[PDB]
Amino acid sequence: YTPSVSHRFIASFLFNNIPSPLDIAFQRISGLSRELQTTQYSQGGENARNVWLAEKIQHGSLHLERGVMTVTPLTLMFDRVLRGEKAVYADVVIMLLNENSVPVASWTLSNALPVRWSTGDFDANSNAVLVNSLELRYQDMRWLGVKV
Amino acid sequence: TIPTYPGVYIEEDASLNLSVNQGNTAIPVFIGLFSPKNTNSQVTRVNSWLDFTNLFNAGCIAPITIVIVNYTTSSDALKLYFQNGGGPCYILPQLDRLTQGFLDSIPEL
Amino acid sequence: TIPTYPGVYIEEDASLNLSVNQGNTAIPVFIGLFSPKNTNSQVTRVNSWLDFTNLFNAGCIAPITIVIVNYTTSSDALKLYFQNGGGPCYILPQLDRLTQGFLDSIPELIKQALEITLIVCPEWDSGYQSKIYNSLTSSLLNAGYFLIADNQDKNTALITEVASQTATYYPAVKVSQLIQAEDSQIAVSGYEDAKTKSDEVKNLAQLKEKNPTVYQQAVQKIQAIQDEIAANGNIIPVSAVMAGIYCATDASRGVWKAPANIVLSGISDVAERLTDDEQGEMNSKGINAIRYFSHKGFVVWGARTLQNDDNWRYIPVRRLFNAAERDIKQAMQSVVFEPNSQPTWERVKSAIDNYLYSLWQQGALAGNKPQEAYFVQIGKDVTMSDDDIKQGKMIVKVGMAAVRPAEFIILQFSQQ
Amino acid sequence: AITPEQIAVEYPIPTYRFVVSVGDEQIPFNNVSGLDVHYDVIEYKDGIGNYYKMPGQRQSINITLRKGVFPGDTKLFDWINSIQLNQVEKKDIAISLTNEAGTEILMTWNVANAFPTSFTSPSFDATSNEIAVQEIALTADRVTIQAA
Amino acid sequence: AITPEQIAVEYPIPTYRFVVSVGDEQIPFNNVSGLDVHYDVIEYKDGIGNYYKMPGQRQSINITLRKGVFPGDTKLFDWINSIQLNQVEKKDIAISLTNEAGTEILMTWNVANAFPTSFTSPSFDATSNEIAVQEIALTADRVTIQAA
Amino acid sequence: TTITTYPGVYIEEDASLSLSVSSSATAVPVFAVAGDNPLISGKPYIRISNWLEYLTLKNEQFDPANTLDISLRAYFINGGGYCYLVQTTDLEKQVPKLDDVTLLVAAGENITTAVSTLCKPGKGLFAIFDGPTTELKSDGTSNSDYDPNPFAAVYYPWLTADWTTTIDIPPSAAIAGVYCSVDSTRGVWKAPANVPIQGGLQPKYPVTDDLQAQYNQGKALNMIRTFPKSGTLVWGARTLEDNDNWRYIPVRRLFNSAERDIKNAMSFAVFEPNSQPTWERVRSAVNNYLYSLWQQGGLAGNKPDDAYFVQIGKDITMTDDDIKQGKMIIKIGMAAVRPAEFIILQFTQ
3-state SS assignment for residue A82:
helix
At position C258, the amino acid (one-letter code) is A
CA distance E8 to C281: 46
CA distance A40 to A54: 9
Phi, psi of E121 (to 5 degrees): -90, 155
Find the CB nearest B4 among C280, C302, C413: C280
CA end-to-end span of chain F, whole Å? 73
CA distance F74 to F163: 11
Chain E: closest CA distance from residue A6 (Å): 10
Chain F hits for B8, CB-CB cut-off 8 Å, are 263, 266-267, 270
Q: D103, C369: Cβ pair inside 8 Å? A: no
Q: Chain A within 8 Å of D87 (Cβ-Cβ)?
A: yes
3-state SS assignment for residue F140:
coil
Say what the alpha-carbon torsion angle F290, F293, F294, F295 is, to the nearest 10 degrees. 120
Count, residues in chain A: 148
At position D42, the amino acid (one-letter code) is I
Say what the alpha-carbon torsion angle A101, A103, A107, A111 is, to the nearest 10 degrees. 60
Report the greatest alpha carbon distance in chain D: 69
Beta bridge partners of F132: none
CA distance A41 to F62: 55
Find the CB nearest C258 among F271, F329, F335: F271
Find the CB nearest F270 among C274, C275, C407: C407
CA distance A134 to A22: 16
Beta bridge partners of C148: C120, C167
CA distance A93 to A10: 8
Q: C295, F331: Cβ pair inside 8 Å? A: no
Question: Which residue from E minimizes the CA distance to D123?
Answer: E33
| Consecutive H or E run containing F246 | none
Q: Which of C292, F163, F314, F87 is nearest to D148 (CA)?
A: F314
- Cα–Cα separations (whole angstroms), residue C385 to C390, C395, F174: 9, 9, 85
**Helical spans, DSSP H, in C333-390:** 342-361, 386-390
Chain B hits for C280, CB-CB cut-off 8 Å, are 4-5
Chain A: closest CA distance from residue D138 (Å): 20
Q: Name, in order, each residue with C-beta under 8 angstroms of C54's C-beta and a sequence gap of 6 or more.
A: C37
What is the full DSSP assignment across B2-57? ---SSEEEEEE-----------SS---EEEE---BSS-----EEE-SHHHHHHHB-
Q: Name, in order, each residue with C-beta under 8 angstroms of B45's C-beta and a sequence gap of 6 or more.
A: B88, B89, B90
- Cα–Cα separations (whole angstroms), residue C372 to B108, C323, C368, F306, F326: 37, 20, 7, 43, 21
- Cα–Cα separations (whole angstroms), residue A37 to A54, A107, C355, D46: 6, 21, 86, 43
CA C97 to chain centre: 23
Q: Which phi-psi region, left, alpha or beta, contains residue C343 (left: φ > 0; alpha: ψ -120 to 50)?
A: alpha
Find the CB nearest D74 among E30, E35, E147: E147
CA distance C177 to C80: 12
Beta bridge partners of C89: C46
Q: How many other C-beta atoms can be found within 10 angstroms of the C-beta atom of residue A30?
A: 12
3-state SS assignment for residue C78:
helix
Report the greatest alpha carbon distance in chain B: 55
Chain C hits for D100, CB-CB cut-off 8 Å, are 368
Among D17, D27, D103, most C C-beta atoms within 10 A, so best to mutate, is D103
CA distance C94 to C34: 7
At position B94, the amino acid (one-letter code) is Q
Q: Which of C149, C124, C121 is nearest to C70 (CA)?
A: C124
Chains touching D, CB cut-off 8 Å, 3+ pairs: A, C, E, F
At position B80, the amino acid (one-letter code) is L
Residue F264 carries which DSSP code?
H
Phi, psi of F25 (to 5 degrees): -90, -25
Q: Chain C within 8 Å of B104 (Cβ-Cβ)?
A: no
**Cβ atoms F251, F338 nearer than 8 A:** yes
Q: Do chains E and B touch (3 or more CB pairs under 8 A)?
A: no
Q: Chain B within 8 Å of C227 (Cβ-Cβ)?
A: no
Q: Which of C296, C295, C307, C304 is nearest to C259 (CA)?
A: C304
Q: How many other C-beta atoms can be found within 10 angstroms of the C-beta atom of residue D2?
A: 8
- Cα–Cα separations (whole angstroms), residue B78 to A126, C311, E146: 84, 40, 64
**Could you tell me whether strands F126-130 and F103-105 are parallel, antiparallel, or unpaired per DSSP bridges?**
parallel
CA distance D112 to C340: 62
**Cβ atoms C191, C211 nearer than 8 A:** yes
Q: Which of C391, C395, C385, C400 is nearest to C349 (CA)?
A: C395
Q: Chain E within 8 Å of C252 (Cβ-Cβ)?
A: no
**Cβ atoms C158, C129 nearer than 8 A:** no
- Cα–Cα separations (whole angstroms), residue C84 to A46, C243, E132: 81, 8, 54
CA distance B2 to D67: 45
Say what the alpha-carbon torsion angle F189, F194, F196, F202 is, to the nearest 10 degrees. 130
Question: Chains C, E: CB contacts under 8 A, how many?
Answer: 3
| Consecutive H or E run containing D51 | strand D51-58
**Cβ atoms F335, F254 nearer than 8 A:** no
Chain A: closest CA distance from residue E117 (Å): 14
List residues of C whose CB lies inside 8 A of any F CB: 258, 260-261, 273-277, 292-296, 303, 403-416
CA distance E3 to D72: 19
Say what the alpha-carbon torsion angle F297, F300, F301, F307 is, to the nearest 10 degrees. -100
Chain B hits for F316, CB-CB cut-off 8 Å, are 17, 19-20, 48, 50
CA end-to-end span of chain B, whole Å? 37
Phi, psi of D123 (to 5 degrees): -90, 125
Chain C: closest CA distance from residue F122 (Å): 9
CA distance B92 to B70: 17
Locate the DSSP E strands across A18-102. Answer: 28-29, 34-41, 51-59, 62-67, 90-97
**Cβ atoms F245, F251 nearer than 8 A:** yes
Q: F245, C296: Cβ pair inside 8 Å? A: no
Q: Name, in order, each residue with C-beta under 8 angstroms of D88's C-beta and a sequence gap of 6 or more.
A: D79, D82, D115, D116, E55
Chain C hits for E1, CB-CB cut-off 8 Å, are 354-355
Q: B10, F121: Cβ pair inside 8 Å? A: yes
CA distance F257 to F264: 11
Q: Name, in order, each residue with C-beta under 8 angstroms of A43's C-beta and a sequence gap of 6 or more.
A: A51
- Scored b (16 or more CB within 10 A) or e, F236-253 reads bbbbbbeeeebbbbbbbb
Phi, psi of D91 (to 5 degrees): -125, 150
CA C411 to chain centre: 37
Q: Name, in order, each residue with C-beta under 8 angstroms of C404's C-beta and a sequence gap of 6 or more.
A: C314, C317, F273, F274, F326
- Scored b (16 or more CB within 10 A) or e, C81-100 reads bbbbbbbbbbbbbbbeeeee
Q: Name, in order, each residue with C-beta under 8 angstroms of F237's C-beta and a sequence gap of 6 or more.
A: F191, F192, F193, F222, F248, F249, F250, F339
